[PDB]
Amino acid sequence: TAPDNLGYMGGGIQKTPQIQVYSRHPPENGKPNILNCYVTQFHPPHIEIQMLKNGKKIPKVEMSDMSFSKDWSFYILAHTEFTPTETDTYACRVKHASMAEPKTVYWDRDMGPHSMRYFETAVSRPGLEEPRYISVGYVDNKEFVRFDSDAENPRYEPRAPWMEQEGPEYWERETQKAKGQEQWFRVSLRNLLGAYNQSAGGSHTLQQMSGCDLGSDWRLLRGYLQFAYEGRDYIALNEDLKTWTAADMAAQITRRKWEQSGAAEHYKAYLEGECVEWLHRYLKNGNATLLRTDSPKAHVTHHPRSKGEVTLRCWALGFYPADITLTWQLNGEELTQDMELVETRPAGDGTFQKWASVVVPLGKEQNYTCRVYHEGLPEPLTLRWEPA
Ligand SMILES: *[C@@H]1O[C@H](CO)[C@@H](O)[C@H](O)[C@H]1NC(C)=O
Ligand SMILES: *[C@@H]1O[C@H](CO)[C@@H](O)[C@H](O)[C@H]1NC(C)=O
């Protein structure tokens, strides 16, 4: 169930994408596969991504829908069917305002327990009175509804199959709230443009995160309600659900207005009331799919580098949910950030992939162990380089 904001924001900077290109399955020449280009941590959300086979645009490339992470940054997965061979090369090319020129990345084949969230975004459009407004609802970090003002018939739509259980009055009620949010983001965007002495020629973004965490007994643990302007923290409701934290001077004015009108009480009532009750219903209705876990399959690869050193890479593949911890230790003693990680990445089939590497001296590989922590496991894994 989505929130309905009340008072508006008061009135009167980019992030470079990180790009991984990687196959879903371990590549074998002649064997069909999927190539992924996962683009994360960028802002603003407008981005152009192309996949290229031998320098030519690949015609059928799937793109995920606009999404952002808890740090406000946007991410996208593009992917395509492909059959690796010895001589074909593949790349992902990304154009984004943070970069003067498009960036081409070549595929280097050789390398509480429950929650609901509504992640909402409004992007102002230089010549149009109305921004684009997208809202994405999540249940246990799995997308379950989505609204996008750019659709031909904008409505909340089910994004998890079990949401077929809601009748028409549900979609209508939720859609009407999305329309109210659209108007609110529009007003706030305009107020913010004056609050910061900006001109309308530009594009600007306002984002919201709202929802609730529950314990394993399904009792409320914490509610959340926070906003970002231009991808930067603006104001957040504190954990008491009564007081606000303002990130800067503009946001303090808003905080003062909202304390005077008691806005926190309205959001408090939503977070502790409908947010919880509707999450209960969604937990029950989506029972069959929300319990699923996939244990990581882990192994260590061995990469001799210059000098007498080696890189050990500890891989975890095939796992769900995406939360995982990979650590390297030396004789049971863990290394305080000596190691190279990679952002966890979707394989595209519902599981995820991650690795972590350390540089060690040749001959001393057996002193190092990798440990994998994941809730799908019966217990944490311990592994080490295993030669032939
Ligand atoms: C979820 O499904 C399992 C397996 O059928 C069932 O035993 C359990 O009681 C269900 N729980 C809820 C909350 O629906
Ligand atoms: C590293 O492994 C070797 C060979 O198994 C072992 O003898 C040695 O004690 C280990 N080094 C340390 C510092 O524990």
Short mmCIF file of C-alpha atoms and ligand atoms in Angstrom, two decimals:
data_model
loop_
_atom_site.label_atom_id
_atom_site.label_comp_id
_atom_site.label_asym_id
_atom_site.label_seq_id
_atom_site.Cartn_x
_atom_site.Cartn_y
_atom_site.Cartn_z
CA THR A 1 0.00 0.00 0.00
CA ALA A 2 1.62 3.24 -1.12
CA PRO A 3 2.01 6.44 1.00
CA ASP A 4 0.23 9.76 0.36
CA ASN A 5 2.50 12.67 1.09
CA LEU A 6 1.03 15.76 2.80
CA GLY A 7 2.90 19.06 3.13
CA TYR A 8 5.22 20.07 0.32
CA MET A 9 8.96 20.76 0.39
CA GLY A 10 9.73 24.38 1.18
CA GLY A 11 10.53 26.93 -1.48
CA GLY A 12 12.27 30.26 -1.98
CA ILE A 13 26.21 17.11 -9.15
CA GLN A 14 26.65 13.76 -10.86
CA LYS A 15 27.77 10.21 -10.17
CA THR A 16 29.76 8.23 -12.74
CA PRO A 17 28.34 4.81 -13.66
CA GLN A 18 30.23 1.68 -12.63
CA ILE A 19 30.06 -0.99 -15.32
CA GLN A 20 30.50 -4.74 -15.20
CA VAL A 21 30.28 -6.93 -18.32
CA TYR A 22 30.04 -10.64 -17.56
CA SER A 23 28.25 -13.78 -18.71
CA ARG A 24 25.43 -15.44 -16.78
CA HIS A 25 27.13 -18.86 -17.03
CA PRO A 26 30.77 -19.79 -17.24
CA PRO A 27 31.56 -19.31 -20.93
CA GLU A 28 32.25 -22.19 -23.28
CA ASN A 29 32.93 -21.58 -26.95
CA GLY A 30 29.97 -22.70 -29.04
CA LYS A 31 27.56 -22.89 -26.12
CA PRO A 32 24.64 -20.39 -25.91
CA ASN A 33 24.78 -18.07 -22.94
CA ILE A 34 23.65 -14.63 -21.76
CA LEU A 35 25.93 -11.60 -21.59
CA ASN A 36 25.14 -9.00 -18.91
CA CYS A 37 26.07 -5.34 -18.71
CA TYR A 38 25.26 -4.18 -15.17
CA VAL A 39 25.49 -0.41 -14.73
CA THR A 40 25.28 0.97 -11.18
CA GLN A 41 25.81 3.95 -8.89
CA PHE A 42 25.08 6.71 -11.37
CA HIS A 43 23.13 9.93 -11.19
CA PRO A 44 21.11 11.47 -12.79
CA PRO A 45 19.01 8.45 -14.00
CA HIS A 46 19.05 9.29 -17.69
CA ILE A 47 21.51 6.86 -19.35
CA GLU A 48 22.14 5.29 -22.73
CA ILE A 49 23.51 1.71 -22.84
CA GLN A 50 24.31 -0.28 -25.93
CA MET A 51 25.78 -3.74 -26.24
CA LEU A 52 28.18 -4.31 -29.15
CA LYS A 53 29.31 -7.50 -30.97
CA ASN A 54 32.52 -6.81 -32.94
CA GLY A 55 31.83 -3.11 -32.76
CA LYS A 56 28.23 -3.34 -34.07
CA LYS A 57 25.09 -2.60 -32.08
CA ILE A 58 23.41 -5.82 -30.98
CA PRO A 59 19.75 -5.65 -32.09
CA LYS A 60 17.91 -7.52 -29.31
CA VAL A 61 19.16 -6.21 -25.96
CA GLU A 62 16.84 -6.47 -22.92
CA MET A 63 16.94 -3.59 -20.41
CA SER A 64 15.59 -3.66 -16.87
CA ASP A 65 13.35 -0.84 -15.67
CA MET A 66 14.53 2.26 -13.83
CA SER A 67 15.48 1.40 -10.24
CA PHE A 68 17.53 2.97 -7.47
CA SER A 69 19.43 1.67 -4.45
CA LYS A 70 19.34 2.67 -0.78
CA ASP A 71 22.11 5.22 -1.38
CA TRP A 72 19.77 6.90 -4.00
CA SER A 73 21.97 5.91 -7.00
CA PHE A 74 20.40 4.36 -10.08
CA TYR A 75 21.26 0.98 -11.62
CA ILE A 76 20.24 -0.90 -14.79
CA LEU A 77 20.88 -4.39 -16.14
CA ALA A 78 21.07 -4.86 -19.91
CA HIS A 79 21.56 -8.36 -21.36
CA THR A 80 21.53 -10.34 -24.57
CA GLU A 81 21.73 -13.87 -25.89
CA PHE A 82 25.12 -14.76 -27.30
CA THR A 83 27.35 -17.69 -28.15
CA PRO A 84 31.00 -17.14 -27.18
CA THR A 85 33.66 -17.94 -29.80
CA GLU A 86 37.42 -17.48 -29.94
CA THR A 87 37.36 -14.44 -32.22
CA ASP A 88 34.19 -12.44 -31.47
CA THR A 89 34.55 -9.55 -29.06
CA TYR A 90 31.74 -7.97 -27.05
CA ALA A 91 31.37 -4.69 -25.28
CA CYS A 92 28.94 -2.47 -23.46
CA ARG A 93 29.01 1.22 -24.26
CA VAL A 94 27.53 3.69 -21.80
CA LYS A 95 26.70 7.34 -22.34
CA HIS A 96 25.99 9.37 -19.22
CA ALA A 97 26.17 13.05 -18.29
CA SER A 98 28.92 12.41 -15.72
CA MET A 99 31.31 11.46 -18.60
CA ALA A 100 32.56 13.68 -21.44
CA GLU A 101 32.57 10.76 -23.87
CA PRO A 102 30.82 7.40 -24.00
CA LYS A 103 32.56 4.62 -22.12
CA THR A 104 33.10 1.26 -23.84
CA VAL A 105 33.75 -1.74 -21.60
CA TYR A 106 34.92 -4.97 -23.23
CA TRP A 107 33.89 -8.34 -21.94
CA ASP A 108 37.02 -9.84 -20.27
CA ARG A 109 36.01 -13.48 -20.29
CA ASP A 110 39.02 -14.33 -18.00
CA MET A 111 37.59 -12.15 -15.21
CA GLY A 112 14.80 -7.39 9.99
CA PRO A 113 13.70 -10.46 8.04
CA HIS A 114 10.78 -8.69 6.27
CA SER A 115 10.15 -5.28 4.81
CA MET A 116 8.07 -3.22 2.43
CA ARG A 117 9.43 -0.16 0.55
CA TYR A 118 8.04 2.30 -1.95
CA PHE A 119 10.92 3.87 -3.93
CA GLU A 120 9.60 6.93 -5.76
CA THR A 121 11.28 9.18 -8.31
CA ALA A 122 10.27 12.37 -10.06
CA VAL A 123 12.45 13.82 -12.84
CA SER A 124 11.69 17.30 -14.10
CA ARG A 125 11.64 17.75 -17.87
CA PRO A 126 13.10 21.00 -19.34
CA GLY A 127 10.13 21.97 -21.55
CA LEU A 128 7.20 20.15 -19.92
CA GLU A 129 5.09 21.22 -16.93
CA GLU A 130 5.00 17.61 -15.75
CA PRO A 131 7.98 15.56 -14.59
CA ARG A 132 8.24 11.88 -15.16
CA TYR A 133 7.13 10.09 -12.00
CA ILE A 134 7.99 6.44 -11.30
CA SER A 135 7.16 4.55 -8.15
CA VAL A 136 8.33 0.96 -7.39
CA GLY A 137 6.98 -1.03 -4.44
CA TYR A 138 9.05 -3.82 -2.86
CA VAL A 139 8.17 -6.72 -0.51
CA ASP A 140 11.24 -8.29 1.08
CA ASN A 141 13.41 -6.45 -1.47
CA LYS A 142 11.48 -8.05 -4.40
CA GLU A 143 9.67 -5.66 -6.72
CA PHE A 144 5.95 -6.26 -6.50
CA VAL A 145 4.18 -3.20 -8.04
CA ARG A 146 5.27 -0.37 -10.36
CA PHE A 147 3.79 2.93 -11.63
CA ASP A 148 5.36 5.00 -14.44
CA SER A 149 3.77 8.23 -15.70
CA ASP A 150 5.37 7.53 -19.09
CA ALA A 151 3.17 4.52 -19.82
CA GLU A 152 0.35 4.93 -22.28
CA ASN A 153 -2.22 4.16 -19.56
CA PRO A 154 -0.38 4.92 -16.31
CA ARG A 155 -1.51 2.59 -13.49
CA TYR A 156 0.10 0.63 -10.74
CA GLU A 157 0.69 -2.81 -12.30
CA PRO A 158 1.57 -6.09 -10.58
CA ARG A 159 5.25 -7.00 -10.88
CA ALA A 160 5.14 -10.21 -8.84
CA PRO A 161 2.78 -12.95 -10.07
CA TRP A 162 1.08 -13.40 -6.70
CA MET A 163 -0.20 -9.79 -6.87
CA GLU A 164 -2.79 -11.17 -9.29
CA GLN A 165 -4.61 -11.75 -6.01
CA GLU A 166 -5.62 -8.07 -5.70
CA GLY A 167 -8.99 -7.13 -7.26
CA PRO A 168 -9.68 -4.05 -9.37
CA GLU A 169 -10.51 -1.74 -6.47
CA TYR A 170 -7.01 -2.25 -5.17
CA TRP A 171 -5.31 -1.18 -8.41
CA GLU A 172 -7.67 1.81 -8.69
CA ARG A 173 -7.04 2.95 -5.12
CA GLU A 174 -3.27 2.57 -5.55
CA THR A 175 -3.29 4.25 -8.98
CA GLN A 176 -5.22 7.21 -7.59
CA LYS A 177 -2.57 7.59 -4.89
CA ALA A 178 0.21 7.49 -7.51
CA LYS A 179 -1.63 10.34 -9.29
CA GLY A 180 -1.66 12.30 -6.04
CA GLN A 181 2.07 11.65 -5.59
CA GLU A 182 2.72 12.88 -9.12
CA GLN A 183 1.11 16.19 -8.22
CA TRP A 184 3.03 16.39 -4.94
CA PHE A 185 6.41 15.72 -6.59
CA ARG A 186 5.59 18.34 -9.20
CA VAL A 187 4.82 20.96 -6.56
CA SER A 188 7.85 20.03 -4.49
CA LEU A 189 10.17 20.01 -7.50
CA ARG A 190 9.02 23.55 -8.27
CA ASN A 191 9.47 24.74 -4.70
CA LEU A 192 12.95 23.15 -4.59
CA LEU A 193 13.96 24.94 -7.78
CA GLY A 194 13.35 28.18 -5.91
CA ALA A 195 14.76 26.95 -2.57
CA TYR A 196 18.15 26.47 -4.29
CA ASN A 197 18.03 29.34 -6.79
CA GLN A 198 18.09 27.04 -9.83
CA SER A 199 16.81 27.65 -13.38
CA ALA A 200 14.12 25.52 -15.04
CA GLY A 201 16.13 24.86 -18.20
CA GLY A 202 17.71 21.92 -16.36
CA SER A 203 16.57 18.51 -15.23
CA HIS A 204 16.32 17.82 -11.52
CA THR A 205 15.33 14.78 -9.48
CA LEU A 206 13.44 14.22 -6.25
CA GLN A 207 13.36 10.75 -4.70
CA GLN A 208 11.53 9.20 -1.80
CA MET A 209 11.98 6.02 0.20
CA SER A 210 9.20 4.95 2.60
CA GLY A 211 8.17 1.72 4.39
CA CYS A 212 8.62 -0.60 7.31
CA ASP A 213 10.79 -3.44 8.61
CA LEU A 214 9.31 -6.31 10.58
CA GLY A 215 10.86 -8.89 12.90
CA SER A 216 10.56 -12.58 12.38
CA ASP A 217 7.40 -12.40 14.49
CA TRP A 218 6.09 -9.85 11.91
CA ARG A 219 6.02 -7.03 14.49
CA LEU A 220 7.13 -3.59 13.38
CA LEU A 221 10.84 -2.93 13.97
CA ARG A 222 11.30 0.45 12.29
CA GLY A 223 9.56 2.73 9.83
CA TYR A 224 11.31 4.88 7.21
CA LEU A 225 10.51 8.06 5.35
CA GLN A 226 13.28 9.95 3.62
CA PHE A 227 13.83 12.24 0.64
CA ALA A 228 16.74 13.08 -1.63
CA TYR A 229 17.10 16.05 -3.96
CA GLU A 230 19.57 15.74 -6.87
CA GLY A 231 20.48 12.33 -5.49
CA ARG A 232 21.61 13.81 -2.12
CA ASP A 233 19.99 13.32 1.30
CA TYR A 234 17.50 16.15 1.91
CA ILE A 235 15.36 15.31 4.98
CA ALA A 236 14.56 12.03 6.71
CA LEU A 237 12.08 11.08 9.40
CA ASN A 238 13.96 9.88 12.42
CA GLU A 239 13.50 6.46 13.98
CA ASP A 240 11.21 7.91 16.64
CA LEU A 241 8.79 8.74 13.75
CA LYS A 242 8.30 12.13 15.44
CA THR A 243 11.33 14.28 14.60
CA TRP A 244 13.16 15.08 11.34
CA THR A 245 16.82 15.21 10.31
CA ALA A 246 17.50 17.94 7.72
CA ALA A 247 20.60 17.49 5.61
CA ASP A 248 21.21 21.17 4.73
CA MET A 249 19.91 24.70 5.15
CA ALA A 250 17.08 24.43 2.57
CA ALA A 251 15.89 21.29 4.25
CA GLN A 252 15.77 22.93 7.70
CA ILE A 253 13.12 25.39 6.53
CA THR A 254 11.10 22.42 5.29
CA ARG A 255 11.70 20.59 8.57
CA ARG A 256 10.44 23.61 10.56
CA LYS A 257 7.26 23.89 8.41
CA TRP A 258 6.62 20.15 8.76
CA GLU A 259 7.13 20.13 12.49
CA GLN A 260 4.66 23.05 12.71
CA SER A 261 2.01 21.20 10.73
CA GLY A 262 2.61 17.86 12.49
CA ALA A 263 3.37 16.01 9.28
CA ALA A 264 5.32 13.33 11.20
CA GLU A 265 2.11 12.15 12.89
CA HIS A 266 0.53 11.37 9.49
CA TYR A 267 3.55 9.46 8.31
CA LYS A 268 3.90 7.76 11.70
CA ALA A 269 0.27 6.53 11.41
CA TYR A 270 0.92 5.15 7.91
CA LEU A 271 4.18 3.43 8.85
CA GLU A 272 2.86 1.77 11.98
CA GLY A 273 -0.63 1.07 10.64
CA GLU A 274 -1.31 0.40 6.91
CA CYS A 275 2.35 -0.29 6.14
CA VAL A 276 2.40 -3.15 8.64
CA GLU A 277 -1.09 -4.51 7.96
CA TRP A 278 -0.68 -4.53 4.19
CA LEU A 279 2.81 -6.08 4.46
CA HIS A 280 1.19 -8.88 6.52
CA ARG A 281 -1.31 -9.52 3.71
CA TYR A 282 1.46 -9.41 1.08
CA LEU A 283 3.62 -11.80 3.13
CA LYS A 284 0.74 -14.22 3.34
CA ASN A 285 -0.26 -13.85 -0.32
CA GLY A 286 3.31 -14.16 -1.64
CA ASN A 287 4.31 -16.94 0.78
CA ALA A 288 5.25 -19.49 -1.92
CA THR A 289 7.83 -17.25 -3.67
CA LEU A 290 9.13 -15.05 -0.80
CA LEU A 291 10.58 -17.97 1.21
CA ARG A 292 12.97 -19.01 -1.60
CA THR A 293 16.74 -19.04 -1.09
CA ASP A 294 19.57 -20.26 -3.29
CA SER A 295 22.83 -21.21 -1.60
CA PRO A 296 26.04 -19.81 -3.17
CA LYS A 297 28.27 -22.24 -5.04
CA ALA A 298 31.78 -21.06 -4.18
CA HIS A 299 35.26 -21.74 -5.54
CA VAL A 300 38.71 -20.15 -5.66
CA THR A 301 40.62 -19.31 -8.84
CA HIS A 302 44.36 -18.83 -9.04
CA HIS A 303 46.02 -16.04 -11.03
CA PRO A 304 49.82 -15.71 -11.02
CA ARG A 305 50.83 -12.05 -11.41
CA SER A 306 54.12 -10.21 -11.60
CA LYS A 307 56.96 -10.87 -9.11
CA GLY A 308 56.41 -14.06 -7.15
CA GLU A 309 52.89 -13.05 -6.21
CA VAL A 310 49.48 -14.56 -7.04
CA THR A 311 45.90 -13.33 -7.00
CA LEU A 312 43.41 -15.67 -5.35
CA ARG A 313 39.85 -14.89 -6.34
CA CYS A 314 37.02 -16.27 -4.24
CA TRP A 315 33.83 -16.67 -6.30
CA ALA A 316 30.24 -17.04 -5.13
CA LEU A 317 27.68 -17.88 -7.83
CA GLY A 318 24.02 -18.80 -8.07
CA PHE A 319 22.84 -17.33 -4.78
CA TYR A 320 19.62 -15.57 -3.58
CA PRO A 321 18.95 -13.27 -1.78
CA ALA A 322 21.74 -10.90 -2.86
CA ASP A 323 23.09 -10.26 0.60
CA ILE A 324 26.37 -12.12 1.02
CA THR A 325 29.71 -11.65 2.75
CA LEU A 326 32.99 -12.85 1.27
CA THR A 327 36.07 -12.58 3.44
CA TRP A 328 39.66 -13.62 3.07
CA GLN A 329 41.75 -14.50 6.08
CA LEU A 330 45.39 -15.40 6.64
CA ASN A 331 45.85 -18.20 9.21
CA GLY A 332 42.39 -17.59 10.67
CA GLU A 333 43.11 -13.84 10.99
CA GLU A 334 41.02 -11.57 8.78
CA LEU A 335 42.57 -8.84 6.60
CA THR A 336 41.46 -5.23 7.30
CA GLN A 337 40.63 -4.15 3.73
CA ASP A 338 43.64 -5.43 1.88
CA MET A 339 41.38 -7.23 -0.60
CA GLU A 340 39.62 -6.36 -3.84
CA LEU A 341 35.84 -6.86 -4.03
CA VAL A 342 33.30 -6.51 -6.76
CA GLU A 343 29.81 -5.13 -6.40
CA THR A 344 27.30 -8.01 -6.15
CA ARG A 345 25.69 -8.48 -9.54
CA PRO A 346 22.61 -10.19 -10.97
CA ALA A 347 23.09 -13.19 -13.15
CA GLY A 348 19.69 -12.32 -14.67
CA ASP A 349 17.97 -15.68 -13.77
CA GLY A 350 17.05 -14.56 -10.26
CA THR A 351 20.44 -15.35 -8.63
CA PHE A 352 23.47 -13.20 -7.98
CA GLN A 353 27.24 -13.37 -8.33
CA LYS A 354 30.13 -11.93 -6.37
CA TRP A 355 33.84 -12.38 -5.92
CA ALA A 356 36.65 -11.15 -3.64
CA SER A 357 40.38 -11.39 -4.29
CA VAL A 358 43.65 -11.00 -2.40
CA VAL A 359 47.29 -10.83 -3.56
CA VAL A 360 49.49 -13.43 -1.85
CA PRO A 361 53.02 -14.75 -2.36
CA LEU A 362 53.48 -17.80 -4.59
CA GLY A 363 53.95 -20.89 -2.45
CA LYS A 364 51.96 -19.37 0.44
CA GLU A 365 48.49 -19.81 -1.09
CA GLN A 366 47.46 -22.56 1.35
CA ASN A 367 47.72 -20.14 4.29
CA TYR A 368 44.73 -18.18 2.91
CA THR A 369 41.10 -19.14 3.34
CA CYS A 370 37.94 -17.63 1.90
CA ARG A 371 34.76 -17.63 3.95
CA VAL A 372 31.25 -17.26 2.49
CA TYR A 373 28.34 -16.11 4.72
CA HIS A 374 24.86 -16.52 3.25
CA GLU A 375 21.47 -17.28 4.74
CA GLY A 376 20.83 -20.01 2.21
CA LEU A 377 23.78 -21.95 3.63
CA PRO A 378 23.49 -24.60 6.37
CA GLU A 379 26.67 -22.92 7.73
CA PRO A 380 29.37 -20.53 6.48
CA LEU A 381 31.73 -22.00 3.87
CA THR A 382 35.48 -22.10 4.29
CA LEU A 383 37.56 -22.72 1.20
CA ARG A 384 41.06 -22.36 -0.20
CA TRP A 385 42.88 -22.73 -3.49
CA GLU A 386 42.67 -26.36 -4.64
CA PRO A 387 45.31 -27.29 -7.25
CA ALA A 388 45.37 -30.43 -9.42
C1 LIG B 1 3.64 -20.89 3.67
O1 LIG B 1 3.69 -22.19 2.96
C2 LIG B 1 4.07 -23.31 3.78
C3 LIG B 1 4.23 -24.51 2.86
O2 LIG B 1 3.01 -24.94 2.28
C4 LIG B 1 3.02 -23.49 4.88
O3 LIG B 1 3.29 -24.65 5.66
C5 LIG B 1 3.02 -22.23 5.75
O4 LIG B 1 2.09 -22.36 6.83
C6 LIG B 1 2.70 -20.99 4.91
N1 LIG B 1 2.79 -19.78 5.72
C7 LIG B 1 2.00 -18.70 5.54
C8 LIG B 1 2.26 -17.54 6.45
O5 LIG B 1 1.14 -18.67 4.66
C1 LIG B 2 51.40 -21.76 6.01
O1 LIG B 2 51.21 -23.14 5.58
C2 LIG B 2 52.36 -23.96 5.84
C3 LIG B 2 52.22 -25.25 5.05
O2 LIG B 2 51.01 -25.95 5.33
C4 LIG B 2 52.48 -24.13 7.35
O3 LIG B 2 53.55 -25.03 7.65
C5 LIG B 2 52.72 -22.76 7.98
O4 LIG B 2 52.66 -22.86 9.41
C6 LIG B 2 51.68 -21.71 7.54
N1 LIG B 2 52.13 -20.38 7.92
C7 LIG B 2 51.69 -19.75 9.01
C8 LIG B 2 52.27 -18.38 9.25
O5 LIG B 2 50.85 -20.24 9.75
#
